[PDB]
Design a protein around this ligand. Structure first.
Ligand SMILES: CCCCCCCCCCCCCCCCCC(=O)OC[C@H](COP(=O)([O-])OCC(O)COP(=O)([O-])OC[C@@H](COC(=O)CCCCCCCCCCCCCCCCC)OC(=O)CCCCCCCCCCCCCCCCC)OC(=O)CCCCCCCCCCCCCCCCC
Ligand SMILES: CCCCCCCCCCCCCCCCCC(=O)OC[C@H](COP(=O)(O)OCCN)OC(=O)CCCCCCCCCCCCCCCCC
Ligand SMILES: CCCCCCCCCCCCCCCCCC(=O)OC[C@H](COP(=O)(O)OCCN)OC(=O)CCCCCCCCCCCCCCCCC
Ligand SMILES: CCCCCCCCCCCCCCCCCC(=O)OC[C@H](COP(=O)(O)OCCN)OC(=O)CCCCCCCCCCCCCCCCC
Ligand SMILES: CCCCCCCCCCCCCCCCCC(=O)OC[C@H](COP(=O)(O)OCCN)OC(=O)CCCCCCCCCCCCCCCCC
Ligand SMILES: CCCCCCCCCCCCCCCCCC(=O)OC[C@H](COP(=O)(O)OCCN)OC(=O)CCCCCCCCCCCCCCCCC
Ligand SMILES: CCCCCCCCCCCCCCCCCC(=O)OC[C@H](COP(=O)(O)OCCN)OC(=O)CCCCCCCCCCCCCCCCC
Ligand SMILES: CCCCCCCCCCCCO[C@@H]1O[C@H](CO)[C@@H](O[C@H]2O[C@H](CO)[C@@H](O)[C@H](O)[C@H]2O)[C@H](O)[C@H]1O
Ligand SMILES: CCCCCCCCCCCCO[C@@H]1O[C@H](CO)[C@@H](O[C@H]2O[C@H](CO)[C@@H](O)[C@H](O)[C@H]2O)[C@H](O)[C@H]1O
Ligand SMILES: CCCCCCCCCCCCO[C@@H]1O[C@H](CO)[C@@H](O[C@H]2O[C@H](CO)[C@@H](O)[C@H](O)[C@H]2O)[C@H](O)[C@H]1O
Ligand SMILES: CCCCCCCCCCCCO[C@@H]1O[C@H](CO)[C@@H](O[C@H]2O[C@H](CO)[C@@H](O)[C@H](O)[C@H]2O)[C@H](O)[C@H]1O
Ligand SMILES: CCCCCCCCCCCCO[C@@H]1O[C@H](CO)[C@@H](O[C@H]2O[C@H](CO)[C@@H](O)[C@H](O)[C@H]2O)[C@H](O)[C@H]1O
Ligand SMILES: N=C(N)NC(=N)NCCc1ccc(I)c(Cl)c1
Ligand SMILES: N=C(N)NC(=N)NCCc1ccc(I)c(Cl)c1
Lengths: 95, 311, 83, 98, 104, 174, 69, 347, 114
């Protein structure tokens, strides 16, 4: 915040909803809770210039959980191969 | 097997609407020291059939409309939405069991105002458009209290599921703890359905034809019945015995019939509100009380320790 | 006390609908603070177990934590059964 | 990204281009502005629901409420423009040219 | 799937009744027999706009049956009453400013 | 397949947007937005957002869009112009549908497409969660938290709505 | 006389009675003679899906008892 | 407008700004902008005339479009980082959208067309708010997201604004349009230095606000909105003509006046970063502003323009307008250069 | 990246408790008391490990306890239990409160016989 009034007064006006690993009703966890927790703890207090390099591993994993781009690409690869074999008769799926 | 179930809801709804026209005429007649239909079939039982056939073989005089698509759209929307309002109703089992059934009915009913608006545009006449806008203003105004009254009741029920109202009223009808809301709810449904003393669309034009006229009429009377079925569930909850569901259906039907007859009773008894006066009945009388009773019904379960369960 | 009483009688005669609205809204704001049952609404809401009660690893110095659900340690809902 | 995001972003782009490419009616441009809100509501709701961000579930409601209040202000300006000129044509709003 | 079928049936039947209501035998063989300010009060605009703003407030009150299940009842009850009171203040403002009048 | 229901709804979503974004008569433009709103609610419904879906219907379509149509009938258009009668509207409408069809055809043929950015086309179901067995709606828990966690949000939201009433009465008094 | 209004009311009442009666009996017919299972929440759906696998005929309303133990 | 309502509406304009400045959540930032735009419109409309209605509508369309683009940036940021914290954005397309949205809100070139027109169409007091208080919230967001802004984009906006502001002001006789183009030019300096030292952005913003408030207040004091009307001041309030002269020279960046300090400091920070061409180009281009400031001094203070006979009737009455804080602001607007090292309080 | 290590199909085999949800609901309260110890050990393992692969053996003991629990009911109280869960199964919501007569018979049988 430009003027960090919240921290000066110790009052929580909107911090409670900034991240998905914060406290949630009935302890319902977000899907990427562990990934966001890891990235936040890696980058805590060292500043964003340092974190962009030193916490790239945690952030890449968290981004993978968020949008699953690498997982979908892998699934697309296996499916495409399976169609070829079905189109060539070299594979019959089990039951 | 589910399509059978849909038809066994649609067809009886349309038949009940047809014979409500007979019942309304005969009840009004006897309150007017006369008889009403009693020639077309024994006790007028064929009168709805003669009227239906007559209307559909009548010349469909539609003036060159400013919008062909909106002329067709309005009756389809009106009738389609009217039938949709019935599919979550527990009688005692709903056709579609919705977790947010109460909210679904509120959302669908709020769309019914488009048929009024579109039919105004299609009329190609600024006089009918102005009549449509006055009706829309009345309808949305009374949507405010219906939603808030409904919310206040659900604070004693605990959920938006319609069948949970049955459970809430196992020991006692909700009309006892909430008769002030039942009073304003009931009058709001009259104004919502443009029923007398709130029938200002009919009165003001005094001061559509054939099948397309018939369809708007069918949708109106389907809504009237559905509103009174909703009122019975909301405030006069019938007990449900899972091994004899038909005892629920008999008792709940009688309450809905009686509530619908009270609509005809009221129409026979009072003069019509002026337009500004039914606007003041809402904004300056019902809404202040509904807001205060909404505050009260949020506090009451908390202060009595009577918060209902979520599930 | 009297000029206010003469004020209430006027609004009761002229605007009974508004007098009732304000009266009900005041009770909705005031009564929760006076009611002796209000405290139970908090307890009942907390007694409803929405999620699994994850057991604690026993380190040998938790005499207030029951080992079995039917042991006598831990919160009791006897107060709720009577209510 | 997921396939649905392709079309939701496309809808926002389509309404943004509609908004930036005026015709004559101010109301037509106000509809495009609501279109952008509706696409934002869907994109936000999908992201929040799929990720199970529980406390963020209220955010689309707040978006809807505030943007509807914005639209009410926009409509009020349109009627005042229409009262002045008898139409809601944007071409009439060119006095401040000089 | 059931809800989709119910909706499709309801509006398909409504469509069929409407079209047949328009196209029935007639037994005749002869030839058959714009964007301005509508003269409508600003008062009717204010009703619709007033309905909208109250409707947006209602959207915020709708979660109340679920909110009453919270352990933070003190906060929840204070905020519910605050919202409804603000709704009442809105009505009081329109009322005392002659926004609910139909004369003139 | 019903496995692509979300994708199909989003295709109609875009077509409704190309409908009113081409800006025909504000009456027909309003219809295109209403259809898009309903289709948009269906998209939200299929992601598990029942309440959020019904809010679009209750508030966006039954609330805001009703007032839009009401205002249009009063202060804009009282009788629609023939749809697609103007060449500019038709050109814009056709162009958006042609673009949309190409995206749909290419993403369906390759089960992926790169329209500026690269998207997957396997179906939206692939990203769904696989472990739900709680005795409540999580969306309902989140929205109900407005009254416990969101005190600040309630205050500023309620204040803005009240000011909206005061403001619009100032604007329109003239 | 007033009771000649009753025949129209009776027809109306039977018409309103059929929807509720039909749904109740159709549910029993399609669910093995029991009430149709209600699943408003993921937990209830999870148990219903587990019942479908346990049934051995892919019918959640076909129950297995101690005879399967 | 009822005076109590006016106060509450003014307090809501401020509250919307404060919410933006204290928020750590993008949703609350967006709400602050929406609340602020809701309350500003009535003060633009308060004199009820077609020009005011056109100005408010053009303002509404610009600001509502920018706020939708901001919301889009926030949501893209949510998808690619799963959080709402107000800070650097985690997606270049989100960064561009937010930067363009804030540029539209600030009226930076090439999104500037609304500023001269809206300012012309509203009363002086409303124009004072629009060109001073309304810059606070968008600048306070740029202050926080700058680590992720595209350097070429932000510097292109800065350069275009200084050029368009300088050129646009050369052709104006209306005082409200002059201040508008002056505002566009000054926003260019504020954002040009942002990538290098945001503290100098704050310094230029604060000094800009003080000087702009002084000009508007002096225009209000005499109810002058045109160049010729201002040229009658010498025959009514000679002291005012001198205060206008000093303030205009300060706004022109002439030493030893206050308005030189922001240009001085911004040039220093840019050169420390081996940026030499851009500061030099900026400083020369700002001479266009100095030109049409000087033109006003000529017709206001340094010559005596013709008067009218009815002006004598005005001699018999005293200034009754509030002119709140004018003596303080004019001194700060002109005599602060010796205290330049005080800028470190802004760190 | 590495290879996601998975157990063998045979490492996951175990006797399954193939009774319907109404049967489990009817026995749930006694089952919670009788099989608490192996159940809590498994749930402690799952929450500490955050990995289903690390608690498979604890999950096999959960199944074994459940089977032995239902074998005891079958041996002794097969008829009161059958009447009780059959009453639960009729309800669309599987309500306890509609089956208190049958619950009392089942409860009285396990108390005497077990
Ligand atoms: C280091 C960097 C460079 C230097 C930094 C300088 C920063 C500015 C310093 C503060 C400047 C404030 C103005 C100086 C005060 C002089 C005004 C005065 O004498 O008013 C006396 C004031 C009224 O005198 P007046 O006859 O109306 O005319 C005075 C001016 O014309 C009144 O005309 P006005 O419209 O200008 O009134 C302004 C004032 C309202 O006028 C005031 O009442 C002055 C209040 C000044 C408060 C002192 C601030 C310092 C304390 C910090 C805490 O507004 C305020 O509310 C204060 C802000 O009498 C009082 O009531 C005293 C205040 C009581 C408390
Ligand atoms: C002032 C005039 C206002 C006129 C407005 C119109 C009012 C119409 C009122 C219609 C309702 C009348 C009630 C009709 C009773 C139907 C027959 C019946 O079955 O009554 C049973 C009822 C007790 O059983 P039950 O309804 O199931 O209540 C248990 C709580 N769930 O019976 C016991 O009480
Ligand atoms: C059960 C009763 C027991 C009796 C004892 C109880 C004692 C405690 C309660 C005491 C409360 C007394 C307060 C009553 C205030 C009445 C104010 C009033 O009389 O104003 C009326 C008048 C509106 O009437 P109108 O006809 O339009 O204009 C007058 C010209 N004839 O002037 C107005 O403009 C009306 C005021 C503006 C509208 C106020 C709206 C109220 C807020 C709506 C929500 C209701 C309250 C909160 C929920
Ligand atoms: C210009 C012409 C204008 C005409 C407009 C007339 C409007 C006609 C009505 C439109 C239909 C809108 C559908 C809204 C249904 C919402 C009801 C609901 O929320 O529940 C239905 C179901 C989820 O059921 P639920 O119990 O709530 O949760 C799952 C189990 N707990 O959820 C589902 O079954 C998913 C269904 C998704 C498909 C909905 C597509 C709607 C598109 C309508 C256009
Ligand atoms: C008119 C509008 C456009 C403004 C003019 C366009 C800019 C012309 C710039 C000329 C090139 C100056 C330059 O860029 O030098 C940069 C360079 C920085 O490199 P550095 O790492 O600091 O040190 C090693 C040197 N390579 O080395 C330096 O920094 C040394 C340069 C010192 C500062 C030069 C000051 C500006 C020089 C241009 C104006 C000179 C002519 C003035 C004529 C006015 C006559 C009225
Ligand atoms: C440091 C800079 C301090 C700036 C102080 C400026 C005070 C206003 C200048 C005095 C002019 C006389 C006056 O009372 O202000 C006029 C204006 C009210 O408008 P007016 O037409 O005069 O009457 C209102 C009736 N509707 O009153 C207003 O609306 C005040 C408008 C100025 C508010 C913005 C000031 C700039 C932002 C300062 C924040 C610094 C961070
Ligand atoms: C301290 C470190 C910082 C250093 C930076 C430099 C500081 C200087 C800037 C301070 C701010 C400007 C304040 C100037 C106060 C002006 C008061 C004055 O000199 O008299 C005004 C004069 C009064 O006229 P009247 O109202 O009629 O009363 C006398 C009866 N005849 O009115 C007249 O008679 C009209 C006079 C005709 C116009 C002549 C203008 C030329 C004189 C300009 C003086 C102000 C200098 C402004 C530029 C700054 C110079 C450095
Ligand atoms: C122009 C009008 C300006 C009005 C300004 C009014 C400011 C009001 C500030 C409200 C927030 C007060 O401070 C904050 O409140 C809420 C409830 O009290 C607390 O929140 C509490 O409820 C929920 C429950 O999970 C969580 O937020 C948290 O677990 C709990 O502490 C915060 O811990 C506290 O930091
Ligand atoms: C609900 C199902 C009922 C199924 C009944 C099926 C019966 C089919 C036969 C229909 C007979 C209709 O009978 C005919 O209706 C049309 C209504 O437009 C009347 O009107 C028609 O003829 C007159 C001239 O005669 C024209 O001026 C008029 O424009 C034309 O519409 C005819 O005068 C009438 O002869
Ligand atoms: C007990 C507290 C319960 C919480 C209540 C919830 C908040 C409701 C806020 C409503 C505030 C309305 O405040 C209301 O303002 C107007 C001021 O013109 C007063 O009404 C006054 O103006 C009217 C004209 O309109 C005059 O005819 C009347 O003689 C005069 O009293 C009302 O007497 C007062 O009630
Ligand atoms: C225009 C602004 C309008 C703002 C309106 C705000 C009105 C708020 C009125 C009710 C506030 C207090 O309401 C009620 O008070 C009692 C105090 O006895 C609180 O305390 C009660 O409940 C708590 C549970 O948290 C118990 O631990 C406590 O023993 C009990 O006394 C309640 O938690 C609160 O629900
Ligand atoms: C003005 C029109 C506004 C319309 C807005 C339409 C929605 C915009 C969608 C933005 C989301 C996609 O945003 C884009 O995603 C891809 C991967 O997913 C990112 O990644 C891409 O560029 C970087 C380059 O280092 C690498 O990750 C990689 O080469 C490539 O995948 C981009 O850095 C980001 O810009
Ligand atoms: N208001 C009344 N009750 N009398 C009346 N004018 N009824 C209208 C007659 C009617 C309309 C549609 C249909 I379908 C049917 Cl069957 C009968
Ligand atoms: N961002 C920049 N380029 N400049 C900057 N703020 N540098 C930080 C160095 C600095 C300078 C003056 C002071 I006083 C303090 Cl405490 C710190």
């Amino acid at each position: 915040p430009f003027f960090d009034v919240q921290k000066r007064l110790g009052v929580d006006l909107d911090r409670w909803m900034t991240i998905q690993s914060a406290e949630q009703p009935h302890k319902i966890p977000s899907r990427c809770h562990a990934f966001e927790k890891e990235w936040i703890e890696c980058a805590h207090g060292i500043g964003s210039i340092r974190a962009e390099k030193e916490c790239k591993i945690e952030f890449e994993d968290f981004r993978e959980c968020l949008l699953r781009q690498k997982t979908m690409k892998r699934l697309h690869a296996i499916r495409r191969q399976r169609e070829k074999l079905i189109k060539e008769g070299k594979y019959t799926p089990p039951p | 097997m589910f399509m059978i179930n849909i038809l066994m809801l649609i067809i009886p709804i349309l038949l009940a609407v047809a014979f409500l026209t007979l019942v309304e005429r005969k009840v009004l007649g006897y309150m007017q020291l006369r008889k009403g239909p009693n020639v077309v079939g024994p006790y007028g039982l064929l009168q709805p059939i003669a009227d239906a056939i007559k209307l559909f073989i009548k010349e469909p005089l539609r003036p060159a409309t400013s919008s062909a698509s909106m002329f067709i759209l309005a009756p389809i929307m009106a009738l389609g939405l009217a039938l949709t309002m019935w599919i979550p109703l527990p009688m005692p089992y709903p056709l579609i069991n919705m977790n947010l059934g109460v909210l679904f009915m509120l959302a669908m009913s709020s769309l019914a105002v488009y048929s009024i608006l579109w039919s105004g545009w299609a009329s190609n006449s600024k006089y009918a458009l102005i009549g449509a806008l006055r009706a829309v203003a009345q309808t949305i105004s009374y949507e405010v209290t219906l939603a808030i009254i409904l919310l206040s009741v659900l604070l004693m029920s605990g959920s938006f599921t319609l069948s949970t109202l049955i459970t809430t009223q196992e020991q006692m009808w909700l009309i006892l703890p909430a008769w002030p809301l039942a009073m304003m709810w009931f009058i709001s449904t009259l104004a919502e359905t443009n029923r007398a003393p709130f029938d200002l669309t009919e009165g003001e034009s005094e001061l559509y034809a054939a099948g397309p006229f018939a369809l708007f009429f069918m949708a109106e009377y389907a809504n009237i019945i559905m509103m009174n079925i909703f009122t019975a569930i909301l405030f006069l909850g019938t007990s449900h015995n899972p091994h004899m569901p038909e005892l629920y259906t008999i008792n709940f039907t009688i309450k809905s019939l009686l509530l619908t007859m009270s609509f005809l009773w009221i129409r026979a008894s009072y003069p019509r509100f002026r337009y500004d006066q039914l606007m003041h009945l809402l904004w300056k009388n019902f809404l202040p009380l509904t807001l205060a009773l909404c505050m009260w019904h949020v506090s009451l379960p908390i202060l009595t320790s009577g918060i209902p369960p979520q599930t | 006390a009297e000029r206010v009483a003469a004020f209430l009688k006027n609004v009761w005669a002229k605007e009974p609908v508004l007098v009732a609205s304000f009266a009900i809204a005041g009770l909705a704001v005031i009564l929760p603070t006076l009611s002796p049952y209000t405290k139970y609404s908090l307890m009942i809401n907390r007694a409803t177990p929405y999620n699994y009660p994850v057991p604690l690893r026993d380190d040998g110095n938790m005499p207030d934590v029951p080992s079995h659900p039917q042991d006598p340690q831990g919160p009791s809902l006897e107060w709720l059964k009577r209510l | 990204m997921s396939m649905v995001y392709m079309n939701i972003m496309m809808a926002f782009t389509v309404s943004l281009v509609g908004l930036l490419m005026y015709r004559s009616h101010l109301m037509s441009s106000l509809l495009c502005l609501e279109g952008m809100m509706l696409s934002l509501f869907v994109m936000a709701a999908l992201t929040i629901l799929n990720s199970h961000f529980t406390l963020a579930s209220m955010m689309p409601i707040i978006l809807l409420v505030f943007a509807a209040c914005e639209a009410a202000l926009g409509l009020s300006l349109l009627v005042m423009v229409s009262n002045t000129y008898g139409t809601d044509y944007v071409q009439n709003l060119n006095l401040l040219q000089c | 799937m059931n809800l989709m079928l119910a909706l499709l049936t309801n509006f398909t039947l409504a469509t069929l009744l409407v079209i047949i209501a328009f196209w029935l035998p007639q037994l005749n063989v002869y030839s058959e027999k714009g964007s301005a300010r509508l003269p409508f009060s600003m008062k009717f605009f204010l009703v619709a706009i007033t309905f909208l703003l109250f409707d947006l407030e209602i959207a915020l009150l709708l979660p109340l049956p679920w909110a009453s299940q919270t352990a933070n009842l003190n906060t929840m009850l204070t905020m519910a009453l605050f919202l409804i009171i603000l709704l009442a203040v809105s009505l009081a403002y329109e009322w005392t400013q002659k926004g609910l009048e139909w004369t003139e | 397949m019903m496995l692509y229901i979300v994708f199909i709804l989003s295709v109609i979503f875009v077509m409704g947007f190309v409908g009113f974004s081409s800006k025909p008569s504000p009456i027909y433009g309003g219809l295109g937005l209403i259809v898009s709103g309903g289709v948009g609610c269906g998209i939200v419904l299929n992601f598990g957002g029942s309440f959020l879906g019904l809010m679009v219907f209750l508030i966006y379509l039954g609330g805001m869009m009703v007032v839009f149509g009401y205002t249009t009938a009063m202060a804009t258009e009282q009788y629609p112009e023939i749809w697609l009668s103007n060449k500019a509207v038709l050109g814009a409408f056709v162009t958006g549908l042609l673009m949309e069809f190409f995206m749909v055809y290419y993403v369906l043929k390759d089960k992926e497409v790169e329209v500026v950015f690269e998207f997957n086309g396997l179906g939206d179901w692939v990203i769904y969660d696989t472990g739900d067995s709680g005795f409540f709606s999580e969306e309902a828990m989140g929205i109900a938290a407005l009254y416990s966690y969101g005190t600040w949000l309630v205050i500023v939201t309620g204040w803005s709505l009240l000011i909206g009433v005061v403001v619009i009465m100032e604007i329109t008094r003239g | 006389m007033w009771f000649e209004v009753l025949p129209g009311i009776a027809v109306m009442g039977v018409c309103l009675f059929i929807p509720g009666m039909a749904t109740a009996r159709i549910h029993r017919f399609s669910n093995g003679g029991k009430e149709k299972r209600v699943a408003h929440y993921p937990y209830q759906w999870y148990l219903m899906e587990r019942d479908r696998r346990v049934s051995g005929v892919n019918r959640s309303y076909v129950s297995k008892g101690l005879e399967n133990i | 407008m009822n005076p109590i309502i006016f106060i509450i509406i003014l307090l809501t304009i401020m509250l919307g700004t404060i919410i933006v400045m204290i928020s750590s959540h993008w949703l609350l930032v967006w709400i602050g902008f929406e609340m602020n735009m809701l309350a500003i419109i009535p003060i633009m409309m308060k004199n009820h005339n077609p020009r005011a209605t056109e100005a408010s509508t053009k303002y509404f369309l610009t600001q509502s479009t920018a706020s939708m683009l901001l919301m889009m940036a926030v949501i893209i940021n949510l998808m690619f980082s799963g959080q709402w914290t107000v800070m650097k954005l985690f997606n270049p397309m989100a960064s561009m959208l937010m930067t363009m949205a804030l540029a539209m809100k600030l009226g930076m070139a090439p999104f500037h067309f609304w500023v001269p027109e809206v300012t012309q169409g509203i009363p002086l007091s409303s124009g004072l708010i629009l060109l001073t208080w309304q810059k606070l919230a968008p600048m306070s967001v740029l202050y926080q997201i700058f680590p992720s802004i595209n350097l070429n984009l932000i510097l292109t906006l800065s350069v275009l604004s200084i050029l368009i502001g300088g050129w646009g002001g050369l052709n104006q006789t209306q005082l409200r349009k002059i201040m508008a183009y002056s505002s566009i030019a000054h926003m260019g300096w504020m954002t040009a230095v942002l990538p290098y030292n945001p503290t100098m952005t704050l310094l230029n913003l604060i000094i800009y606000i003080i000087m702009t408030s002084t000009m508007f207040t002096m225009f209000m004091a005499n109810s002058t909105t045109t160049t010729l009307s201002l040229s009658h001041t010498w025959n009514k309030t000679p002291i005012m003509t001198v205060l206008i002269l000093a303030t205009l020279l300060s706004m022109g960046g002439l030493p030893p006046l206050s308005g030189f300090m922001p240009k001085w400091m911004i040039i220093q920070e840019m050169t420390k970063n081996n940026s030499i061409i851009l500061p030099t180009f900026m400083a020369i281009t700002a001479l266009l502003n100095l030109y049409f400031y000087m033109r006003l001094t000529y017709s206001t203070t340094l010559t005596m323009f013709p008067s009218t006979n009815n002006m004598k009737m005005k001699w018999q009455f005293p200034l009754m307008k509030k002119m709140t804080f004018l003596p303080t602001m004019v001194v700060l607007s002109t005599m602060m250069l010796p205290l330049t090292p005080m800028l470190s309080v802004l760190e | 990246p590495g290879i996601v290590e998975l157990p063998s199909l045979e490492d996951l085999k175990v006797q399954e408790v193939k009774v319907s949800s109404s049967v489990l609901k009817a026995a749930a309260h006694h089952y919670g008391a009788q099989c608490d110890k192996p159940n809590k050990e498994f749930m402690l393992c799952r929450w500490e490990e955050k990995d289903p692969r690390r608690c498979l053996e604890e999950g096999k003991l959960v199944n074994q306890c459940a089977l032995e629990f239902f074998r005891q009911i079958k041996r002794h109280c097969a008829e009161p239990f059958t009447e009780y869960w059959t009453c639960i199964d009729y309800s669309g919501l599987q309500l306890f409160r509609r089956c208190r007569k049958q619950q009392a018979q089942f409860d009285e049988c396990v108390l005497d016989k077990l």
